[PDB]
Structure 1
Amino acid sequence: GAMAPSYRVKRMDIAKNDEECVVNAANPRGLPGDGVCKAVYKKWPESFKNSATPVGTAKTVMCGTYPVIHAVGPNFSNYTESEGDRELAAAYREVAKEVTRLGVNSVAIPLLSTGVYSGGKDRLTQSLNHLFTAMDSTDADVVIYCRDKEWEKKISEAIQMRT
């Protein structure tokens, strides 16, 4: 575990992370994809061997000794708000199980279902609150990665609010 488990947020490419493992915002088929998934495929292509997994689950594949946790959030274009909310919560619970099993002291994590799976809605708060519900009982240092300057400020505010 980390000495004093924390949450942080950085605005940069998660492929440049300084953590002991990474969470990919994966598709269910283990395809290279777009956004985070494309950056992760470029950086860790070996981790896409047999990475296909259903919605609401996470599957870890090693790139050398570096763990890539493929977490499949729902595409809100296809799911109802209710069913999508349940699957998005479940994906993060499976990430917390993997992070714990791996025994890492730190993890880099994107906000699942906030980009091309958002069904064109702002899901910062919904996705971040499911991340906290899952990760709060873990003792890894969590570093959240985002692209957008306004999102960085809002995520930083949400973290600071609860400290």
Structure 2
Amino acid sequence: APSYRVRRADISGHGEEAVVNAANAKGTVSDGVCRAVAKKWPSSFKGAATPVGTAKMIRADGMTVIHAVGPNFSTVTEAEGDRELAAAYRAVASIISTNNIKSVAVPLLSTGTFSGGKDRVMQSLNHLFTALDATDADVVIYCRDKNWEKKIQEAIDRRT
């Protein structure tokens, strides 16, 4: 059984065994979590392009980086994006499990420039739970916002 906690902090300062990048399909550096990951582990982007709804792992710069591509909700229907977001987190969980990764720092996929102008924190979080529940990892959810942190914490507590 996995554990979940939430941390309001820069994901690049995480204390876990692996980190999930909120990647884009082309493997390019963009603002936010992605830029933080690229500054800290710059060689982790080599060959990281992966389709929407999948994830791709690399060991680089003494870190395990999982590039997970959630959908851009401007470019898919609502139901399609929901399916793709679910798949992205399932791909993450698969990488966690198959590589015996014991703790992981995870951002909320598709919540920023990919959100298509809708609040997706809870949508993303609930897919995160469903997927990583298949694992036994200590999951640390990273956010920047004090509003989000309490919301996520409530959600974790509601499960307890």
Q: TM-score, normalised by structure 2?
A: 0.97
- Map residues 108-147 of structure 1 onto 2, 5 A cutoff: 108-147=105-144
TM-aligned CA distance change 1:5 to 1:133, over 3 Å: closer
Report the Cα offset of residue 117 of structure 1: 0.3
CA distance in 2 between counterparts of 1:30 and 1:45 reads 12
TM-score (norm 1): 0.96
Correspondence for 2:10 among 10, 13, 24: 13
Q: Which moved more, 1:60-69 or 1:17-26?
A: 60-69
Establish whether residue 32 from structure 1 lines up as the match of residue 29 from structure 2: yes
Q: Deviations over 1:23-81 (max 9, x none)?
A: 00000011011111111111111100100000000000111442100000000111110
Alignment counterpart, residue 148 of structure 2, candidates 147, 151, 154:
151
For residues 2 and 127 of structure 2, what CA distance do their matches in structure 1 show? 18
Contact 2:41 2:61 in 1 (8 A): no
Distance 2:76 2:151 in 1: 26
Does 1:74 pair with 2:71?
Answer: yes
Unaligned segments of structure 2, at least 5 residues: none
Q: Give the fraction of aligned pairs with identical amino acids, expressed as a percent.
A: 69
The count of aligned residue pairs is 160
- 1:12 is aligned with what amino acid? A
Root-mean-square deviation (CA, aligned residues, Å) is 1.0
Which residue, out of 79, 87, 93, partners 2:90?
A: 93
What SS class does the counterpart of residue 8 from structure 1 fall into? strand
Aligned partners of 2:136 and 2:97: how far apart in 1?
8
Structure 1: which 5+ runs fail to align? Answer: none
Extract structure 1 runs of 4+ deviating beyond 6 A. Answer: none
